[PDB]
Paper text:
The first step of the route is the production of N-acetyl-L-glutamate (NAG), while the second is the phosphorylation of NAG by NAG kinase (NAGK). We report here structural and functional studies on the arginine-sensitive NAGK from Saccharomyces cerevisiae (yNAGK). The structure of the mature yNAGK, lacking the N-terminal mitochondrial targeting sequence (residues 1–57), reveals an unexpected novel tetrameric architecture, which can be described as a dimer of dimers with D2 symmetry. The AAK domains occupy the center of the molecule flanked by two pairs of interacting DUF619 domains.
Although the resolution attained was 3.25 Å at the most, the high quality of the averaged electron density map allowed to unambiguously trace the entire polypeptide and to identify the majority of amino acid side chains, particularly for the DUF619 domain. The full-length enzyme tetramers consist of the AAK domains occupying the central part of the molecule, as in the truncated enzyme structure, flanked at both ends along the Q axis by a pair of interacting DUF619 domains. The central hole described for the truncated enzyme is also present, together with two narrow openings between the DUF619 and the AAK domains. The structures of the four tetramers found in the two crystals deviate from perfect D2 molecular symmetry, with three subunits in each tetramer exhibiting the open AAK domain conformation. The degree of AAK domain opening is even higher than in the arginine-containing subunit of the truncated enzyme, corresponding to a 20° rotation of the C-lobe. The pulling of the C-lobes by the paired DUF619 domains possibly contributes to this opening of the AAK domain, which is associated with rotations of up to 55° of the DUF619 domain around a hinge located at the AAK domain-DUF619 domain linker (351GYK). Comparison of the complete and truncated NAGK structures explains why the presence of the DUF619 domains does not influence the Km values for the substrates. This lack of effect on the apparent affinity for both substrates reflects the lack of physical interactions of the DUF619 domains with the substrate sites, which remain equally exposed in the structures of the truncated and the complete enzymes. The DUF619 domain is a bilobar (N-moiety, residues 354–447; C-moiety, residues 448–502) open αβα sandwich nucleated by a 7-stranded antiparallel β-sheet, which has the characteristic architecture of the histone acetyltransferase fold (GNAT fold). The comparison of the GNAT domains from NgNAGS and yNAGK (with an r.m.s.d. of 2.52 Å for 111 residues) explains why yNAGK lacks NAGS activity. The AcCoA binding site in NgNAGS, found on the boundary of the N- and C-moieties, is blocked in yNAGK (compare Figures 8E and 8F). The pairing of the DUF619 domains on each side of the yNAGK tetramer involves hydrophobic interactions between the E′ and F′ helices as well as the continuity of the central β sheets by way of antiparallel bonding of strands 6′ from both domains.
Author numbering:
A (entry chain A), D (entry chain D): 98 to 502
B (entry chain B), C (entry chain C): 67 to 502
């Protein structure tokens, strides 16, 4: 499912065209972002205009009875503004100003009419998408009994992400990305699994940053590995959504390969079976997975696979210059370069390696790029890397030719 | 669309239907089109009937504001949870828990209709809040029941402007943001007051109003003429009196162009454009004014204009000029509305009085002011004769109002109420005598 | 679209129009709607008029097969190349060179129309060959002129199926592949024969046929009844005689369902569905068969089934059984079409004969076989009386056929042709006498 | 204009979906190919079905009076079949079965009702495209007087290409190309200026082939040197339309390459020097063309150059496994695969060859495809072909490594 985009209210006032044209682009290429917005700046100006002092404790707006009336009006206006904007560019939008979030009071005497989201109702957002309209949500919850409660836009966004498990979660701000405070290096990427601990330890990472990165981790720990969070400025949005660099920060968990040395260590032997069935010489070749796995049990080998076994490499360690014996990766895996991931790991753990690919394998070109040498014979190509000993090359080639037997 | 045309044509029979449809499509006026109050019962039991019908209006380019309740569904749920549904004074005592059931039902019923319509290619836009603001009607008597203080146009407009049907729930909310339950029929009226739409359709089960003393389905009511004497009737029940009263009160506020329909769901497409349909259509109309001398007409020139549309004066061999000379010296009774859109003149000499002139513009034909005038005539003149051109546009209508007819020289003699075989001969003979 | 609906509704007046329109939208529809022969003169001088009009049909979901000539354009070119245009027997002597000019013109005229239609949003598909196969008509008399041996449907069908109007040139071709010039009016007939369309419209400049002695646009012609006496007329010019004759010859080949319209381009949308329009519509109409005894009816059971549709026999208190008893011993004339879709019975006793039964199915009403039957009646019975129920479905129609009417006891006495003041009294008195 | 695609009739019978869906894709992305189809088999199948020997001289069908009737019927059927197919997939198609080609008799007694296209009328094809419909032409001409004449599909296609000068000209066949009928070697390139005469002289080149290649030469003699024809299989159509490689036979005019063995034979020594100055290691590299040509004079070498010296290849013939020493081709040449031209000639004159390409040359992938083996070192890749002696490979690699001095 595609994206949840949290829009700061500031943007609807000051960049309606930039924003609208950009969502319109997504709409045009057939993508349907769930859009959820606040209304910060606008509201304080109105409360002043009516002689109400805007009022906060703990970074939360104390939303009393009168203030709610101003807040509600602003939400609804800001929300049509965006919908209208989008319609003008030919994009079907559907304002959804209630009926998505249900909440309790966060603290009835501290904050008055501020909410705490207890659940998300999908049906409106789905209906909208199904009917070919972008859904444009206000971050406004409501008790069962029907009192509307003001609720934090950033937390609403998260609650949606949790339910809809979208691929991208974009937080549109003014600032833009995150800047490394000690070198000014705009941080364009963060792989949490690797980088998180040492980033939180940094002198420069301010408290506000720590809390943001932490809350992003907490979100991403349960969504798919496919998902990611982007902190960008509005203009460089179209860019950051598909290019991994862009000009904003993109955070994600970062992907896993698991090194195993025995069938024993695989959590499901049946998962392995399915994984191996996509092979060119097992899918109906003359070697049943059954009997192949027999040979493995009694074999010096190292395997590398992601959790879903979308890519499985197997290095047989006998014969100096070990052989990459199987490398069975689904198309899904090729497109997300998990294949590059797996070779990178291989290249570090096996400084010399040989393998064979069919002369007209779909991505023979790729293999060539990863090799240091190639030899063609009988519609198969021997590839190897890291063995620039003139002599062991001869050995290698000779054995390969020997086995068109 | 083939689709639309087929369904248009299914719901036409008389030309007077065709002429009314045409008039709604060549509304050059960006006056607002219609508010349609839909009982909740209909969304459960006739979603297709209703949706296809709204879809037709959408297709022909008309954009009804649709406002719906949720009555039946809710009581069934409260029972299902072991809560007694609870009313005082015909109002639902909507406590905290009950509101939660009501709100859920509103939102469901509402998507149900929007989704339905989308499936048929109609852009719908659910508007479940932000239109009606209310106070509490009485906070300890009714708890969370509202009283509508105002209506916010922007959502409904924006929707229409962006090409989507707006589908409103009848659910108000205090400034502070507590949703209050509010009567669907009253909400419909408050919209109508603010948007001054041309049609206000109230979908019910009953259908129209039936004349309890003759079974004559009452298809039309011009209040300015008919209201008083209709309320005076033996057969008219209290429930009816209250409905008609509340419709008068509404239409007194709106333009003369506007009108209210009470119909059943199935005959909806029909009653929205055809003046007859199979339900009752109320509107203000104008009152007919009985006068007995040119003196009493406020504008003599207005009279002259009125009479010039005649088939035998617009260039026939009796100038209105000379006719109005004869009138001044004549025993006559006249009937016309204020705008002289319809004028009848009965010359009272000769037993069996002659309806000497009867000249109504097309406007008048479509709003059956013609029927109004004949009804008055039929009461004030139990026997009457009159002559219409052989190929008058609505010669058929005259035939229906007559008890007998005679054709000669491209004119038809019509009469009613004189079934004496003999005075008929006299009548016919004099009429023939005067083609020379 | 509002656009279309408006233009549909502009061209409706009677319900009989509405009911015909409905039939065409739920007809055989698509393939079998109509063949429209367009004179080439029109593609040069009225492309918009024509295009917009076809476009309207396309929009309400109808798919006319359009077949055009190229007359004028081609002579202008042949002159422009210094070739004399050349005819014997109303056929163009199409030699080798002249064919090249004819072919070029066909193909141009043909795109011109398709393009024009596309520009208005109508999918069109030029079909410039592969429909008609022909022999030489006479190789030395006419050179490259053809004689249509057969019509290949597949292209025309495919086009309609894929939602495009087919635009045919009238250009045949031998099996071996030499193109032969073929008369557009004859081509149109050959299509009609294969596709049995409901309408065959011949677009001309002239317009319809105008009664040269009263200026009365002749809007309808039932050939089986009217043909002989029309041809006998002083005013019917030779050119008219030849056209009507050639139309009879065509319609004698096609179904009874079929009909030919001779109209001008502008009143096309109108004449295609409305039975009046402002052009002449010809059709064969029906052989009504005059019988004077039950004996002569080919099936007595067919008669009984025919009469059972009556309002006072379908469950009224006079069984068809006993009615037919009374007929056997009765001076009567009956008129019925072959299918007994309409059956009229005139009881001949009592001066002013009575049309005693007139039992016509709805099918019959819509195809005005009822008008047929009355036309015959009117000729064979110069004075006639009849009684119809006050609320018969088409009481209005009866009124139009009468010269006088009297209402009593929910029945209307109608008569025609007796404008003797006195025998009218007699007539009315007897009628009143028999509600008791 | 985008492309003319000649579709063999065989394809409409055996791959209507493959073909239709593929054109449908082009239609969807807003491209409008002119599609011209034949009707070969279907017609031959009928003539057999009626016991008539299909009858050809010179690769042309002797179309008598009856045989034309069969042809015409088959054209019209095959043509709707394709239009209908496309419509079903949402693509507006417009059958154009006449009125595009006007012809004389090619030879009235040799071929009977076969035509010779005297002109092509654009207006129908343009109107169709303008009106948003794919035009689907039959290759069927007609005399001024209106006799329809049969015209080879391949020749009609050339006549369109001539008039419309489309960017791509695709000839869809079954083979996937032209396969050398005596060795099964898929011919991937044909430079007509060099190869044409000796290819037509071949035993295996069937009469149908001769007529297609001839009509392609005639076409390409009219058009720019930039233009070319691709004869591909249906599945690699989407591919060949945007990728410059794709994979079937690609024909084009090329230049006649001139084999010289001494500076003496070059008509201008100054023209040679200019040609070599575009090199990456002479344009300001540490080996002046001046001194390089000194070494050549005293060198066993073969050179190959077109007349304009847009491409110059130099094979140094010492050391078994000769070296392609210089290969200096302007960008113009690269884009028009003069590199393919030159390799074809090389492969015929030198059954074993070695050469070196930069690790990140723009078309390193191409070189890999032309090789039988590769070795990477010091940002250069050694390539060779035709030497599968395990031992001389060692020699080869060792010397190459030796020379990163
Ligand atoms: C044109 C001709 O003489 N011969 C070919 C043309 C059809 C095709 O190219 O498939 C034939 O078989 O009739």
């Amino acid at each position: 499912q595609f994206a949840v985009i949290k829009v700061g209210g500031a943007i609807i006032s000051d960049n309606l065209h930039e924003l609208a044209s950009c969502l319109a682009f997504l709409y045009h290429v057939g993508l349907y972002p769930i859009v959820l917005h606040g209304t910060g700046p606008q509201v304080n100006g109105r409360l002043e205009a009516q002689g109400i002092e805007p009022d906060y404790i703990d970074g939360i707006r104390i939303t009393d009875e009168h203030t709610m009336a101003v807040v509600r009006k602003c939400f609804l206006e800001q929300n049509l503004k965006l919908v209208t904007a989008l319609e003008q560019l030919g994009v079907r939008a559907r304002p959804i100003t209630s009926g998505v979030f249900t909440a309790d009071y966060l603290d009835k005497d501290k904050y008055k009419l501020v909410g705490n989201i207890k659940s998300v109702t999908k049906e409106p957002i789905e209906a909208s998408i199904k009917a070919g309209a972008l859904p444009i949500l206000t971050s406004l919850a409501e008790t069962a009994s029907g009192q509307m409660l003001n609720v934090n836009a950033d937390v609403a966004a998260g609650e949606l992400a949790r339910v809809f498990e979208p691929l991208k979660i974009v937080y549109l701000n003014e600032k833009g990305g995150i800047i490394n405070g000690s070198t000014g290096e705009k941080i364009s990427m963060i792989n949490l699994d690797e980088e998180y601990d040492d980033l939180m330890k940094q002198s420069w990472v301010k408290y506000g940053t720590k809390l943001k990165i932490r809350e992003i981790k907490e979100l991403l720990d349960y969504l798919p590995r496919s998902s990611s969070v982007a902190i960008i400025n509005v203009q460089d949005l179209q860019k950051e959504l598909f290019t991994d660099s862009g000009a904003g920060t993109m955070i994600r968990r970062g992907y896993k390969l698991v090194k195993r040395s025995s069938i024993g260590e695989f959590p499901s032997a049946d998962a392995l079976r399915k994984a191996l069935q996509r092979d060119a010489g097992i899918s109906s070749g003359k070697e049943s997975v059954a009997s192949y796995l027999r040979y493995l049990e009694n074999s010096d080998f190292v395997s590398y696979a992601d959790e879903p076994l979308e890519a499985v490499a197997i290095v047989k360690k006998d014969t100096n210059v070990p052989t990459l014996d199987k490398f069975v990766c689904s198309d899904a895996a090729w497109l997300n370069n998990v294949t590059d991931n797996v070779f990178n790991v291989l290249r570090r753990d096996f400084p010399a390696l040989q393998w064979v690919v069919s002369e007209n394998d779909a991505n023979i070109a790729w293999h060539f790029d990863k090799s240091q040498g190639s030899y063609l014979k009988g519609g198969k190509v021997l590839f190897w890397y890291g063995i620039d000993d003139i002599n062991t090359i001869s050995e290698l080639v000779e054995n390969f030719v020997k086995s068109c037997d």
